[PDB]
Amino acid sequence: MDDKELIEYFKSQMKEDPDMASAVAAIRTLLEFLKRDKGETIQGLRANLTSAIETLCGVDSSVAVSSGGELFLRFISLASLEYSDYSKCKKIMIERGELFLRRISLSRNKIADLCHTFIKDGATILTHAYSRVVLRVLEAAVAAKKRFSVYVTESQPDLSGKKMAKALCHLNVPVTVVLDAAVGYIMEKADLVIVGAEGVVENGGIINKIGTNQMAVCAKAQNKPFYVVAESFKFVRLFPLNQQDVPDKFKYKEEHPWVDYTAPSLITLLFTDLGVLTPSAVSDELIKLYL
Amino acid sequence: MDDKELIEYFKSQMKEDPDMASAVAAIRTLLEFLKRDKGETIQGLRANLTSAIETLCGVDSSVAVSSGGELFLRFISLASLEYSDYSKCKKIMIERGELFLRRISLSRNKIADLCHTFIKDGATILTHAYSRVVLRVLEAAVAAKKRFSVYVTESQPDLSGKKMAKALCHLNVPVTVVLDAAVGYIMEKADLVIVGAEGVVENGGIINKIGTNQMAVCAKAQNKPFYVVAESFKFVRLFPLNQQDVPDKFKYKADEEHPWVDYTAPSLITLLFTDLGVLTPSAVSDELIKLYL
Amino acid sequence: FLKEAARKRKFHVIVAECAPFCQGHEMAVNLSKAGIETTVMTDAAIFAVMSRVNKVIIGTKTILANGALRAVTGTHTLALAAKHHSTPLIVCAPMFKLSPQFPNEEDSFHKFVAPEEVLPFTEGDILEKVSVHCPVFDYVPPELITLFISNIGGNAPSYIYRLMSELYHPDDHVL
């Protein structure tokens, strides 16, 4: 009911598996919460969901979880209810939630078999951080039997890019763990950039691990392409104009951030399970997705 | 002086005072070596000096060392010699080398007195590493009662930024050590970025510690005017064009890994600082062909 | 320059006027007194007309030791425009307009004149909380100009820091 076990179940699930992303565990916790609601209303649920979201934004601050909660609460109330007895509402809403979580699950697979046709065999993937979606993109790019060298910058705030490097070279790919300060160097020999995404703001540029923006502009420096892969529930309706504009609950968690903003004029294309989008299209489909 | 006395004397010159550039130590050790002549023949002398430069770079391949030693050889034999006896000539050479080392000692304070007229009031300086030149110019800017703050990037391989942060809060200046990846984040609130070159090729760029190229290109993205301080014993004669065009004898310095030093083009740099004055990176080319003669 | 290089040809001279106090207007009258097809315009719409212009001759007040001259106001925005349309910047300055200081050497590098010409005193009460700036000299950066017409010929922003040593000394920078 209350956070006293809601939050514990959330953490247990989210940390049961690393391939299991965070905000999808948030969605699943909201669903089990509905499965243990024990109440008679809908308004009180339009408020109790927000309560669970605000107790979830503390255990995790990533734009992922806020996006997941908001978008799920939005879409769940889409098939016109016309309540019968606060029970038909229950069935139809849990059905909407099941359908949404399954869409979420297959988002990664869809973006996998949609992305793999972009690594021009014999190229240089330059990722930036351990990101399940980039990982299972490169997996389906080696399954279709291409070849490519992967530079994973190390993401100084926590040397976790090494985790991507290890789990990736587990798949027999030539990996090279560059210095994340060297993203001015290896950019001479990066045929494309595939950065994992943790949420997309409206205008198209995205919120990503600290070392993204620099890499981003480095791309636009040397006219390389910059590609992102944002899972389907990583949309938020912020709209920053400079790295300080993003909400402070997101950046922090001396003075050094953790996520920052890549302006849209640098991203060349986005790969979501909603297809392939020039950023203007992500503005459009974000408006018409939240509705 | 079979080159083991050479290197042991160089390490002594290092640990006696670690702060100074490796290259001024290189020139001092080459001068002391020159005093340990054992023979007055101009030719076998400069051949000995070149072998000495080679055995020097064999332990500290920082572009500083090679640049400085070659400039040393350039400036020793400037005037005529008329070596009718070859010993008074070596006296003249020791004298000229001493004058050269005096100019190298004046480099820092010349930089300090020419530069700090550029940090306008209430700005946020950004740097990248333990550029003792930038440290002393920052001191000569704060002690002129200017007001600013300062950010610094830890420069992961060896966390030099942290050591500079220590030696800068020791100067009572508001200093923050941000992650080296975050050079893009901060690049908007920090007005101008000062950094200290360790090599200045003919075109006008620099060859500085690993986290420089990204910093230059970011501070050219968001139009934050760049400034690099570089003293007159680091005017190299290279000319890279890409990252692969800095020779391996400069990059790794060690003897699925990382480089150490890398390039930055003369368009991403606004004004260079030498004890020859303030230069726009084409002045590097002109004054370099005129300095090497 | 123009009214000599236009008694052979006839062509387009789009004279902007300095908005603080109209300066290009007697310029326009003097040009038109020989019939040069002069089109006067307010300095606020340059980025409008800039894309139908070919050579950007700007008259400057003085140059620096970067080439980054500082000239009559509104020339920096004209330079940003005429680089956004990649036209040349054909400066026309003789030698004596060249001083070997550097850009950020003068606190208030500009020259603020009496705000009375921007919001004349006859306004009234609102003159109590209005910092009416009026910087009548603006600072062109180095990399926006391409061609100095000095009276020795054409030159480029990197054949200036040698006109110093050819004309002045090093230690006369502070005078």
SS3 for A240?
coil
- Spatial separation of the C-alpha atoms in residues B148 and C82, rounded to whole Å: 34
Q: At what angle do helices A279-290 and A63-76 cross, to 10 degrees?
A: 50
User: For the purposes of burial, counting CB atoms within 10 Å of the CB of B177, is it exposed (0-12), middle (13-18) or buried (19 or more)?
Assistant: buried
Provide the domain limits for residue C10: 1-166
Residue C49: inside a domain, yes or no?
Answer: yes
Handedness of CA C146, B204, B151, B123 (dihedral sign): negative
Lookup: tokens for C14: 């789009």
Q: Are strands B148-153 and B175-178 parallel, antiparallel or unpaired?
A: parallel
Element (H, E) at A271: strand A269-272
Structure tokens, B89: 């000539």
Please report, for the domain that includes residue C144, its CATH number.
3.40.50.10470
Is A3-109 in CATH node 1.20.120.1070?
Answer: yes
Q: Does A252 touch chain B if contact means CB atoms closer than 8 Å? A: no
Distance CA B93, CA B98 (A): 8
Residues of C with CB under 8 A from a CB of B: 65-67, 102, 104-105, 107, 142-143, 157-158, 161-162, 170, 173
Contact residues, chain B, for C107 at CB < 8 Å = 120
* Contacts by residues A219-223 (CB-CB < 8 Å, ≥ 24 positions apart): A219/A187, A219/A190, A219/A193, A219/A266, A219/A268, A220/A265, A220/A266, A220/B221, A221/A187, A221/B217, A221/B221, A222/A187, A222/A188
Chains B and A, touching by 3 or more CB pairs within 8 angstroms: yes
Q: Could you say which DSSP state residue B41 is in?
A: -
Q: Which residues of B touch C (CB under 8 A)?
A: 117-118, 120, 267, 270-271, 277-280, 282-283, 286
- Give the DSSP H or E segment for C141: none
The residues after which chain B has a C–N gap greater than 2.5 Å are: 255
User: Of A178, A157, A261, A186, which Cα lies nearest the Cα of B154?
Assistant: A157
Q: Which residue in C107, C162, C173 is closest to B286 by CB distance? A: C162
Specify the CATH number of the domain B4-109. 1.20.120.1070
Q: Subunits with at least 3 CB pairs below 8 A relative to chain B?
A: A, C
Tell the CATH topology of B110-292. Rossmann fold (3.40.50)
Separation of alpha carbons B77 and C167, rounded Å: 30
SS3 B223: coil
**Degrees to nearest 5, angle at CA A234 with A233 and A239:** 130
- C and A adjacent (3 or more CB pairs under 8 angstroms): no
B256 interfaces chain A, CB cutoff of 8 Å:
yes
User: DSSP characters for B167-198?
Assistant: HHHTTT--EEEE-GGGHHHHTTT---EEEE-S
Q: State the architecture of A110-288 in CATH terms.
A: 3-Layer(aba) Sandwich (3.40)
**B271 and C102 in contact by Cβ < 8 A?**
yes
CB B211 within 8 A of CB B153: yes
Please report whether residue C55 resides in a domain.
yes
Closest CA to A202 of A241, A155, A236: A236
B189 close contact with A: CB closer than 8 A? yes
Dihedral sign of CA atoms B42, B43, B44, B46 in order: positive
**Which of C63, C66, C106, C164 would you mutate first to test chain B, the one with the most B CBs within 10 A?**
C66
Residues of A in contact with B185 (CB under 8 A): 210, 213, 243, 257, 260
A2 lies within 8 A of chain B by CB: no
Using DSSP, state whether C60 is helix, strand or coil. Answer: coil
Do A3-109 and A110-288 show the same overall fold?
Answer: no
Given A179, A185, A188, which is nearest B156 (Cβ)?
A: A179
Whether residues B280 and C67 touch (CB distance < 8 A) is answered with yes
Instruction: Let me know if residue C85 belongs to a domain.
Output: yes
- Spell out the domain ranges in chain B: 4-109, 110-292
Tell me whether residues B120 and C104 touch, CB distance under 8 A.
Answer: yes
Distance from C-alpha of C126 to C-alpha of C131, rounded to nearest angstrom:
11
Task: Single out the residue of A196, A197, A198, A200 nearest to residue A282, CA to CA.
Answer: A200
Amino acid letter, B130: Y
For residue B287, what are its two tokens?
A: 């004054």
Quick check: B182 and A257 CB within 8 A? yes
Range C150-164 burial, b when 16+ CB lie within 10 A, else e: beeeebebbbbbebb
| Pair A243, A261: CB distance under 8 Å | yes
Q: How many domains does chain C have?
A: 1
Instruction: Identify which of B46, B49, B50, B56 has the alpha carbon closest to the alpha carbon of residue B26.
Output: B56
List chain B residues with CB under 8 Å of A177. Answer: 256
Which segments of chain A does DSSP mark as H helices, in order?
3-16, 22-34, 43-59, 63-76, 88-115, 132-143, 161-169, 212-221, 248-251, 279-290
How far apart, in whole angstroms, are the C-alpha atoms of residue B92 and residue B115?
Answer: 34
